[PDB]
Amino acid sequence: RVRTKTVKKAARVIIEKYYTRLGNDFHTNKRVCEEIAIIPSKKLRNKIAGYVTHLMKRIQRGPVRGISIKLQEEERERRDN
Amino acid sequence: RPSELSRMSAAQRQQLLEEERTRFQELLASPAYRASPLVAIGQTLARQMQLE
Amino acid sequence: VGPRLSRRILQQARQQQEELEAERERTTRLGP
């Protein structure tokens, strides 16, 4: 199967918003997405968790500077509110 | 008994197999299924369609 | 600076270097 654009658009917003709180496996971020987005369809929650898990398997292999500054700004919006 | 095999239980599939075992062993040794194999099968679907 | 101005600067800066390094008939026969 191919991935629908509504899954992919929902995929990108979660990672840039709540990166710190999620993990690396499918089972971990299935728990998280239940607690972060309402996701009225169960099949959507199934698809959104895996494609988040697929990116998180990839983003971990990259250089950590892109991670490091993103953690810098994540708390920066977090401590302000 | 449903028509497709995905709907009945796993137990119900087994007597489908064991009745199938009987139906070949009575028919492979049948006198008609030694001369014209294709004709007998075609004639069997000929009467089966005619009844239904 | 931008693409158009920098293209002229790099080409001009190269040519000033060459006239610092700067300060016959071609060899028709090959065997002496």
Partner: protein
């Protein structure tokens, strides 16, 4: 043409190339300049082939102009130049590198030429190019790959200078520059690389943005031919200190630095699969890493998937020689009791563990396989074990199976033989799985078991037919797969008693056993080609044994056509083409039945029949096939719309166009002309780059701080090659997605 010594002498070419240096036409005419450096490629490659050590003598002057001529504003100059330079290096330098040996900065002979090779290309890295940098980096990549091992004492200047390029604010060739350093690490090895460019992640730092973090992804994907002793003495002291540092800041309440320092240490446990590709010192340094890996797999859940992947690299491609095989096998007594604990521990990456198990027994001794087989069998037969623990060690039986001797396997088979009639499907599946895998070994003690219990397995697989569940079929077929391949001629009683199940297995609940069933029916035929001299009538014996499945119940008549569909795809001409049309004629009668299952397999037959059976013999049956298709039904046409529309496409391409309209009824006429319409119709890993919503190359941006100096060695940092510079939220704050 590369002429011989009588046609062209070696000393003649030196005079030619030195003469041709006086033309170099201007810089940018592109018509002879491509041809000019094409022959200087061709003259040099010929001069090297005749006398090689003189060949390195003339190389530096050509590479003087070749680096210089990269500045020409024509693109086709740039592509042809590096294509010339790469073919010199792949052919004139790479095989002859070993005779040169290691080169220092003070070489004298032909190695001094290699010093001038690299000193030329380093001049190709500064600010003056700024548009050839994608082309120069390709040149360095091959140049690193061929000469990196024997020229590492001179190459330390570029690796600094390659490092300072990536500090540019916007480098479009970040993807390419990693490829240059990555290949360089492959030949030189990270210990040399890290001396020229030191990592500054050596524990404690004042900042948090580590400017040289890109090295660690580079090293992971490219290290394959380095001694393993470097990883023990360098990274593990840094691995433990960073891990200790992050937990210290974890309890301090700050979750940002600890999350950074955790992410750093996890990335530098991923180097070990790289470091264990082809070690040169695995015979002596593997003793230094057994116990630390043993601790790091037991009490570290995060590193489990790394280490279990890491071992699989070491066994498969780091165990070529027999001397390296001993110490891994010498440590098998330690890792199995650890790895057995992790798999059976109640809840986790179990399947990551099981694949590591399957590899690790393939290299170990057989007596310890036998010993743990006894102990695992004790856990199975123990009634004081939970069902989860029972099924957990049952997989461990399957892994332990093929490496045992003939004696232990026969004891194991006697143990498992009463289990095949179990009502618990999980136990029955593992029970057939044991009998499957012991036949899967084509050689060794497992192959000996095949003819030993040959009657015993045959009766066991037949009396266990009546209590076989639906999920248990998939190992049963694979069990049947491996014994038909070694079955003798006096076993037709087994094969003919095996047909009604496997044809019924073609339409069972799973898809896994279906492809197992399709593959077996192929070799069931290959069983019958070996049982007769005249091949066609043997396979005619094969098909007449399955024809009575065409007459019976709606489940089996749809089953039988599916098998006949797959048989004709593989034994195309072995049937005898005269046999085909009657089978097509019977399925035409089958096409009229109201049940949708039979017409599902009937249309699939007609789809494959036209491909296999020849057009002239199909021409004799054009009328008969679509006479039934026309008068099927309204809904049956409406349901199977494109499947009928597909078989319409097959005829009109292969046959005449007008012929089908005369035989079809009215409704299919407007459908068919849509198909004539169709046949006329036919006539890179940073956060920003991965989260993407998905003349021209000569543009440079000067930057203007301290005033710009073009004669500064670090001026290439301050020139650039590219451009500088939604859902609804609930009252709870949770996102709303639709």
């Amino acid at each position: 043409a590369r002429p011989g010594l009588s046609t062209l002498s070696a000393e003649l070419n030196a005079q030619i190339i030195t003469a041709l240096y006086d033309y170099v036409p201007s810089e940018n005419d592109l018509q002879p300049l491509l041809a000019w450096l094409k022959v200087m490629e061709k003259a040099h490659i010929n001069l090297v082939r005749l006398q090689w050590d003189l060949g390195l003598g003339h190389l530096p002057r050509f590479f003087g102009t070749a680096v210089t001529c990269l500045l020409s504003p024509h693109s086709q100059v740039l592509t042809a130049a590096t294509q010339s330079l790469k073919e010199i290096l792949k052919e004139c330098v790479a095989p002859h590198m070993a005779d040169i040996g290691s080169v220092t900065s003070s070489a004298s002979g032909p190695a001094q030429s290699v010093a001038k090779m690299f000193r030329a290309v380093e001049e190709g890295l500064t600010y003056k190019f700024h548009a050839a940098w994608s082309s120069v980096l390709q040149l360095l990549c091959v140049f690193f790959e061929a000469c990196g091992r024997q020229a590492h004492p001179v190459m330390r200047k570029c690796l600094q200078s390659l490092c300072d390029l990536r500090l540019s604010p916007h480098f479009p060739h970040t993807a390419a520059l990693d490829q240059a350093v990555g290949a360089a690490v492959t030949s030189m090895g990270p210990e040399v690389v890290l001396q020229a460019v030191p990592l500054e992640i050596d524990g404690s730092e004042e900042t948090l943005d580590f400017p040289r973090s890109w090295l660690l992804p580079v090293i992971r994907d490219h290290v394959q031919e380095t001694r393993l002793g470097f990883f023990t003495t360098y990274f593990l002291p840094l691995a433990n200190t960073l891990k200790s540092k992050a937990m210290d800041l974890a309890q301090a309440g700050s979750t940002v630095e600890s999350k950074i320092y955790d992410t750093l240490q996890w990335q530098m446990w991923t180097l070990l699969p790289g470091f264990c590709t082809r070690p040169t010192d695995v015979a002596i340094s593997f003793k230094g890493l057994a116990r630390t890996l043993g601790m790091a797999i037991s009490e570290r859940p995060d590193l489990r998937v790394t280490v279990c992947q890491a071992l699989r690299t070491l066994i498969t491609k780091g165990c070529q020689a027999e001397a390296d095989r001993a110490e891994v096998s010498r440590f098998a007594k330690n890792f199995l009791p650890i790895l057995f604990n992790l798999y059976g521990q109640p809840v986790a990456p179990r399947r990551a563990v099981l694949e590591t198990i399957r590899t690790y027994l393939t290299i170990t001794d057989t007596q310890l396989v036998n010993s743990l087989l006894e102990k695992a069998s004790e856990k199975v037969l123990d009634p004081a074990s939970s069902d989860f623990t029972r099924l957990s060690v049952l997989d461990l039986v399957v892994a332990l199976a093929p490496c045992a001797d003939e004696a232990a396997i026969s004891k194991l088979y006697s143990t498992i033989r009463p289990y095949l009639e179990s009502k618990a499907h999980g136990v029955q599946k593992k029970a057939y799985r044991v009998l499957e895998e012991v036949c899967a070994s084509p050689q060794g003690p497992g192959a000996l078991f095949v003819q030993s219990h040959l009657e015993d397995l045959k009766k066991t697989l037949l009396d266990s037919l009546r209590s076989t569940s639906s999920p248990a079929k998939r190992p049963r077929l694979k069990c049947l797969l491996h014994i038909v391949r070694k079955l003798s001629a006096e076993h037709k009683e087994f094969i003919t008693a095996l047909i009604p199940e496997v044809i019924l297995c073609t339409k069972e609940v799973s898809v896994g056993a279906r492809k197992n069933a399709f593959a077996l029916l192929v070799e069931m035929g290959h069983a019958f080609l070996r049982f007769g001299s005249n091949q066609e009538e043997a396979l005619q014996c094969y098909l007449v044994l399955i024809y009575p499945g065409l007459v019976g119940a709606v489940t089996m008549v749809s089953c039988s056509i599916l098998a006949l569909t797959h048989l004709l795809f593989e034994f195309k001409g072995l049937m005898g083409t005269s046999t085909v049309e009657q089978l097509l004629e019977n399925v035409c009668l089958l096409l009229a039945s109201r049940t949708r299952d039979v017409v599902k397999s009937a249309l699939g037959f007609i789809k494959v029949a036209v491909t296999v059976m020849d057009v002239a013999h199909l021409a004799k049956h054009v009328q008969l096939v679509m006479e039934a298709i026309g008068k099927l039904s309204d809904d049956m046409r409406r349901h199977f719309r494109m499947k009928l529309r597909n078989l319409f496409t097959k005829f009109i391409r292969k046959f005449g166009f007008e012929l089908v309209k005369r035989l079809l009824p009215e409704e299919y006429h407007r459908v068919l002309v849509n198909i004539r319409k169709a046949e006329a119709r036919a006539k890179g890993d940073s956060i920003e780059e991965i989260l993407a919503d998905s003349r021209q190359r000569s543009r440079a941006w000067l930057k203007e701080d301290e005033p710009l100096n073009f004669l500064d060695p670090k001026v290439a940092q301050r020139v650039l090659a590219t451009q500088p510079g939604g859902f609804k939220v609930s009252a709870d704050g949770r996102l709303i997605i639709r």
